[PDB]
Amino acid sequence: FPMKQGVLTHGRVRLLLSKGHSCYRPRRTGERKRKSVRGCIVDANLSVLNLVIVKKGEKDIPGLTDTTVPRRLGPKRASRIRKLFNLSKEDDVRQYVVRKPLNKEGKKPRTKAPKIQRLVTPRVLQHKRRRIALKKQRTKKNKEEAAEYAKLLAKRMKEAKEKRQEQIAKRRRLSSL
Amino acid sequence: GISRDNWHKRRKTGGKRKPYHKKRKYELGRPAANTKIGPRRIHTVRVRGGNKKYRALRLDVGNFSWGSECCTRKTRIIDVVYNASNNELVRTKTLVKNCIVLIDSTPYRQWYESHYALPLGRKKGAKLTPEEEEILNKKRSKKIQKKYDERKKNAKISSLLEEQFQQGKLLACIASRPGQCGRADGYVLEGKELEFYLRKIKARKG
Amino acid sequence: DIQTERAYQKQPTIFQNKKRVKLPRYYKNIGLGFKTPKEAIEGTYIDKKCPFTGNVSIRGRILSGVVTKMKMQRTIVIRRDYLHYIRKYNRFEKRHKNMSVHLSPCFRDVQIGDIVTVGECRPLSKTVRFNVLKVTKAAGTKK
Amino acid sequence: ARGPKKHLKRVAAPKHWMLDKLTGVFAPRPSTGPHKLRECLPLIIFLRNRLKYALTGDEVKKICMQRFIKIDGKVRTDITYPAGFMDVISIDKTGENFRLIYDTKGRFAVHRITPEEAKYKLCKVRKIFVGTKGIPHLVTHDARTIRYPDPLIKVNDTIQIDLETGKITDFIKFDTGNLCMVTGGANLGRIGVITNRERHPGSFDVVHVKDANGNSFATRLSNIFVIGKGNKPWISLPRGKGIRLTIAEERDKRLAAKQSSG
RNA sequence: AAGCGUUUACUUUGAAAAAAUUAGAGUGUUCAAAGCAGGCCGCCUGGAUACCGCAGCUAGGAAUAAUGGAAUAGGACCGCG
RNA sequence: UACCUGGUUGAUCCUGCCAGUAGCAUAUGCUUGUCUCAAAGAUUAAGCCAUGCAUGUCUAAGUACGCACGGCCGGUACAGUGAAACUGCGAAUGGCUCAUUAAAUCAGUUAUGGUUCCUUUGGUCGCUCGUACUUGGAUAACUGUGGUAAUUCUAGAGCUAAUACAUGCCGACGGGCGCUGACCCCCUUCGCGGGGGGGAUGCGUGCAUUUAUCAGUGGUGACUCUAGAUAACCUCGGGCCGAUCGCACGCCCGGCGGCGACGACCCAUUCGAACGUCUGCCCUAUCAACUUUCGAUGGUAGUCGCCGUGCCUACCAUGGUGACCACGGGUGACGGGGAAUCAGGGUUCGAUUCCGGAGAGGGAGCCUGAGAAACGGCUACCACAUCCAAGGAAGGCAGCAGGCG
RNA sequence: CCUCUGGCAUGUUGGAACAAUGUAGGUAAGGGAAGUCGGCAAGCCGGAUCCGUAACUUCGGGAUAAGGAUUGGCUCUAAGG
Ligand SMILES: [Mg+2]
Ligand SMILES: [Mg+2]
Ligand SMILES: [Mg+2]
Ligand SMILES: [Mg+2]
Ligand SMILES: [Mg+2]
Ligand SMILES: [Mg+2]
Ligand SMILES: [Mg+2]
Ligand SMILES: [Mg+2]
Ligand SMILES: [Mg+2]
Ligand SMILES: [Mg+2]
Ligand SMILES: [Mg+2]
Ligand SMILES: [Mg+2]
Ligand SMILES: [Mg+2]
Ligand SMILES: [Mg+2]
Ligand SMILES: [Mg+2]
Ligand SMILES: [Mg+2]
Ligand SMILES: [Mg+2]
Ligand SMILES: [Mg+2]
Ligand SMILES: [Mg+2]
Ligand SMILES: [Mg+2]
Ligand SMILES: [Mg+2]
Ligand SMILES: [Mg+2]
Ligand SMILES: [Mg+2]
Ligand SMILES: [Mg+2]
Ligand SMILES: [Mg+2]
């Protein structure tokens, strides 16, 4: 059973674990589960124990510190490639994306590159221009339809006031009667 | 869990209805907010339909309206003085709908002296040397002095309200539901309602 | 008179503390040709559950029952009667239903044994769903 | 049922779809849309069982997602779309335009129209709303909530809608003498002039309608759809022209037709 | 034309009333139980109608059976102050 | 098809039952050549279940650096299929069963003016007046060390994206509208005064939310409706005002552009749901009084809930139902559309293919989600039961097959 | 049971030890009448408030039946003139 950070025994204990807890992968959404984890205090009753060296000593151990493992993937976000290769705001990123070499038996050697996500490209600029054109034509058609309704209401209200005008004229005729 | 059921209780005749289904989810109850006075702490609750509710737990300020002269201000709440529901809601200081609180009269005094330029509160003998009330009350032009003179005939206040202003704190009644909406909105008690609740607080003191 | 409860008993809509220098009463018509009574306008009571001066809508069914008991406060019990037809025998049964209806204090003098029109509203209590809409006196009983 | 239901049995389907008893356990459940569950006719029912352009639901899917059919001036790609009353289902390759009206019986009819008629259709207003800046809103029977309408158009009228702009052109006020379609109930599919309006406060109001051949009949307001000023409609009427001649007259008119054809 | 008109019960009509079932219309599944199809040298068509108790809604009828009015005139009607 | 016959007597006429007669199911016996349809572990045991299956899902349009395949035209990213994995949606439908439940479920009828509603469809999405040529940092798949008798168990180390999760602006946009108003000017008076215009500066100024005040565009039979004005608020467990995606690719003189996808406040609409209104059900009195401060019936004021309401709490009132059968008990009781028998009457059945309900061994509690008190989801307790190294882990056929009883 | 007024010097002796056996109080783990003629003796329960109370019966009782819960201090609130 795995040890778990922040449980503060030396033995084993059972917990409800959720999404975002350690030592548990939920299958369906919102699922919780009883799992039995181990205390975070170390004692002699451990099968395997994980150690992470943070400070380099004097000696070059042939197990760990001699062989550098190269990091497998290169940065994909344009912002992180700007941070990695210290780009300015103006200069391009596309020549400074790391591409990876590819070689095995039989087939041709290749070089492969990631899709650079979130860069300023003309399709993004076209989308941004398109919805702001949608906004200005929404205000346009609102102005149009409101003015058209104002004209139609002015028509109907002058009709109603002239009809009630001849009705008030009939009232004055009956009062003169 | 805690439920709101008509099926769990007796008929009109007094007979016992036997349940045919479980406690459904939609017949739901929840623990009370029991909103106190303190530095504000509002929890959100997920609601039927994916909505949300804002339970106050501690709540220091609230937006109270002074209805006769139409000014509402965010105002700090100091005490709960009366509750028609229960006296323990007065004792353990609890904000519910239609509970009666005390709130400090300082924003209403600021608005009143800004609007009419007359002293309200002000036990006479004290005078503010930092001159802010002086530039509030003075310095009007000749064109606008008759405007303020036209206002100050409609600037007389009730004597009970003027006592509460000299006290520095006035009675309000809460009208929002602070366990439901989140706010402590209400209105200043005036007139017949005011002297009714003053008679109730005087009868409580004795 | 009024103000016999713990809280202040007031009609919610009308604001009574506008500054001066009597109290305006809120009322309405409930419709369906039911003429709102005179005591609902010259009245000094307030009522949350009055059909004329309160926040209830009369909607749906319009029934009529017979007042039997007026012991509950602001509400009474009417007794409806009807003939139920069994189909084997070609006869009727006298059955009855006792429902509790809300009696506003605008209808002042009501005795037992007079036919009362009620109207369906929102559920006002556990067993009350009807307001009293108009009252007619009994057979004679004008003394 | 712990939520919304998604199926429909073949037996419990509304009968005017005229689905056979034997070939299926399920009927096609109409998707939610601008018409009610029992008032609409699904587009799979319109193609497969009646026009027979398709044979099964897979061919219905192929027709509907080659982007061919264009209902109410717009292409819908779902099989079970609800096509209801007065809807214009247009097919572009055959050049064939269909308007959805009930015939003399309760069922819907294949009703071929011209493109000049298919450019518009007609809608009963259900409610007038006032929106967030004093903006008059008109709501139709197919939920077309066009706003700023003509302030003479009120609650129970009908309007003519140009589909390309999606906007009103003219209207018919609900008044006596106007023709009306009965869109529901036992009188489903009749055509006649409104001869009387009976008001009822609280309950639903009824209307006496006198048809083309004298036979008057009453129907409540919610089932009534006015179709034109006076004695003439604004749409083209189907075969039969909304009479419901009796079963004896149906009998002898088919008997005389078969006797005359031979 | 709109509104009001002792109240019911009863009777009549109209609405509203899921299909499948039952009765039942059409229709040579080779007949039938069935099914909603089919028929003509592309066209012509059907997939009806009835019943749906009780209760509630509507509009006519007033015979039968209840129910009321004016009797310490707090009665109608016409007006008056 | 509105039907009778034998039987008490030595014989008769009767009341009268027993028995014959005819269907419709359930089992069973004996028999069974053709063909069309067709019920089927409901009755006792809603008793127990080995094994297998029964819910997953990718488009041109969210994420693709697994050479897992593949094109050469590269050097100004990304051809295109694409396993996996993250994300979104479904998994609350369907299927099965009848144990519960007797004004309950359910049927007809109404109401929501007393509420919620994913999706669909239609509206709205420069309305506010105060780095945007695109912001941040995680994480899975991948790689590499492992642990455990064992599971759809997972730890530690490295990398790396978003339509996952956060942050957050320019534009429109120059002013209108209110308040504030220094000051300016005109008329008139002995003059104060009176009467009238113009206006520096500052504050606020959208929709939703919450509260209070005023007036009475569009409605309804009827609002405390809808809309308008004012005054403040706008929840840090934060309501909107797009930091997205794909096809064709153009036009001004770098800027304007077409057609769609996806996403969201609010409003209608749809599928509903849930509480209500009125009327309706089998037997039993060897069940005649029941309910009631341990809510029973109301009133008031609140809490909770989506809303109405004793739903719950506090304070008061002493009510509420019953011979018109309440209350209690039984049911070999799910209700109903219907089925069988039938002259007219009725009588019995309805576990069962359609509608509604309830339930997944028994009860209870709950996460997520629009919708679950969900069980082919979790959390316990009881009963039953599988594997084990004895420390632990996993279960729910009243789904389809099938097995036991 | 403790104290005030009033009374007294522990009841016909004092001192030093603290052994057995006593007389008179107590306490006991685990069991709980196996002891004994026999639960002898000791022990349990115990007041009050709020509930709840059976067989039987002379209808009066049984009945404080049996069986439960609560109880202190303090700070308040309500009601009873
Ligand atoms: Mg009979
Ligand atoms: Mg289901
Ligand atoms: Mg039917
Ligand atoms: Mg004999
Ligand atoms: Mg013999
Ligand atoms: Mg026999
Ligand atoms: Mg043969
Ligand atoms: Mg079984
Ligand atoms: Mg049973
Ligand atoms: Mg049963
Ligand atoms: Mg059944
Ligand atoms: Mg059974
Ligand atoms: Mg369930
Ligand atoms: Mg089982
Ligand atoms: Mg299930
Ligand atoms: Mg469950
Ligand atoms: Mg299962
Ligand atoms: Mg002594
Ligand atoms: Mg002595
Ligand atoms: Mg002595
Ligand atoms: Mg002992
Ligand atoms: Mg002991
Ligand atoms: Mg012995
Ligand atoms: Mg003894
Ligand atoms: Mg005894």
Domains of chain D by residue range: 1-116, 121-171, 174-244
Q: Do C17 and B67 touch (CB under 8 A)?
A: yes
Total domains, chain B: 3
Structure tokens at D5: 């239901």
* CB distance D51 to D112 below 8 Å: no
The number of angstroms, rounded, from the C-alpha of C60 to the middle of its chain's C-alpha atoms is 15
Q: Does A143 touch chain D (CB under 8 A)?
A: no
Q: Which domain holds residue B110?
A: 106-168
Strand E contacts (CB < 7 A) among D residues 86-105? Answer: 105
* CB distance B72 to B83 below 8 Å: no
Rounded to 5°, angle at Cα C88 from C84 and C94? 20
Q: Which helix (H) or strand (E) holds D255?
A: helix D247-261
Give A65's contacts (C-beta < 8 A, 6+ positions apart).
A53, A56
Q: Chains with 3 or more CB pairs closer than 8 angstroms to A? A: D
How close, in Å, is residue A149 to chain D by CA atoms?
6
Structure tokens at C104: 């506003």
Find the closest chain B residue to C12 by CA distance. B175
Answer whether any strand E atom is within 7 A of the Cβ of D217.
Answer: yes
In terms of domains, do B75 and B127 share one? no
- Beta strands C92-102 and C128-135 are parallel
* CB distance D197 to D210 below 8 Å: no
Answer whether any strand F atom is within 7 A of the Cβ of A89.
Answer: yes
> What is the spatial distance, in angstroms and rounded to an integer, between the CA atom of D235 and the C1' atom of E37?
32
Q: Does C97 touch chain B (CB under 8 A)?
A: no
Q: Which nucleotide is nearest to D23 (CA to C1')?
A: E35
Nearest to D45 by CA among D87, D82, D8: D82
Structure tokens at A131: 């919805």
In terms of domains, do B78 and B179 share one? yes
C-alpha span between B112 and B168 (Å, rounded): 14
C-alpha span between C142 and C135 (Å, rounded): 14
Nearest to D77 by CA among D89, D66, D87: D66
D9 CA to centre of ligand 13 in angstroms: 22
C-alpha span between C95 and C101 (Å, rounded): 19
* DSSP string over chain A: --B-TT---SSEEEEEE-BTBTT---SSTT--EEEEEE-SS--S--S-------S--SS--TTTTSSPPPPS----BHHHHHHHHT--SSS-STTSS--EEE--SSSPPEEE----BS---HHHHHHHHHHHHHHHHHHHHHHHHHHHHHHHHHHHHHHHHHHHHHHHHHHHHHHH-
Q: Does C16 touch chain B (CB under 8 A)?
A: yes
Q: Which CATH architecture has domain C1-142?
A: Beta Barrel (2.40)
Give D255's contacts (C-beta < 8 A, 6+ positions apart).
none
Q: Which helix (H) or strand (E) holds B147?
A: helix B142-151
Which nucleotides in chain E lie closer than 7 A to a protein CB? Answer: 2-5, 9, 14-21, 25, 35-37, 44-49, 53-59, 67-71, 74
* CB distance D126 to D140 below 8 Å: yes
Nearest-by-Cβ selection for B67 from C5, C6, C15: C15
Q: What distances in angstroms separate CA D169 from CA A154, D162, D237, one per listed residue?
A: 18, 7, 20
C58 backbone φψ class: left, alpha, beta (φ>0; ψ -120 to 50): beta
What amino acid occupies position B195? Answer: E
Give B164's contacts (C-beta < 8 A, 6+ positions apart).
B105, B170, B171
C-alpha span between A15 and A13 (Å, rounded): 7
Rg (CA), chain A: 37
Q: Which helix (H) or strand (E) holds D132?
A: none
Question: Hey, is D248 helix, strand or coil?
Answer: helix
Rg (CA), chain B: 23
Give D183's contacts (C-beta < 8 A, 6+ positions apart).
D39, D85, D102, D124, D223, D224, D225
Solved with: cryo-EM
Strand F contacts (CB < 7 A) among D residues 83-122? Answer: none
* CB distance C76 to C7 below 8 Å: no
In terms of domains, do B112 and B98 share one? no
Nearest to D178 by CA among D233, D240, D101, D239: D233
* Length in residues, chain B: 206
Mutual angle of helices B191-205 and B159-167, in 10-degree steps: 60
Strand residues in chain C grouped as ranges (E):
62-69, 75-85, 92-102, 115-120, 128-135
What's this structure's resolution in Å? 3.3
Residue written as token pair 């967030």:
D132
Q: Do B191 and C127 touch (CB under 8 A)?
A: no
Nearest to D40 by CA among D10, D84, D70: D84
Question: Hey, is C65 helix, strand or coil?
Answer: strand
Nucleic strand G interface residues, CB < 7 Å: B 87, 91, 204
Q: Which nucleotide is nearest to C79 (CA to C1')?
A: F324
How close, in Å, is residue C79 to chain B by CA atoms?
15
Chains A and D are in contact, defined as 3 or more C-beta pairs closer than 8 angstroms: yes
Rounded to 5°, angle at Cα B204 from B203 and C2? 50
What amino acid occupies position A102? Answer: L
Nearest-by-Cβ selection for B68 from C6, C18, C126: C18
* DSSP string over D21-84: SSS-SBPPPPPSSSS-TTT-EEHHIIIIIII-S-SSHHHHHHHHHTT-EEETTB----TT-EE-
Q: Which helix (H) or strand (E) holds B194?
A: helix B191-205
Structure tokens at D198: 């009976």
C-alpha span between D234 and D123 (Å, rounded): 12
C-alpha span between C119 and C61 (Å, rounded): 6
* CB distance C136 to C108 below 8 Å: no
Find the closest chain D residue to A157 by CA distance. D151
Q: Do D201 and C62 touch (CB under 8 A)?
A: no
C-alpha span between B68 and A94 (Å, rounded): 69
* DSSP string over D105-116: SSSB---EE-HH
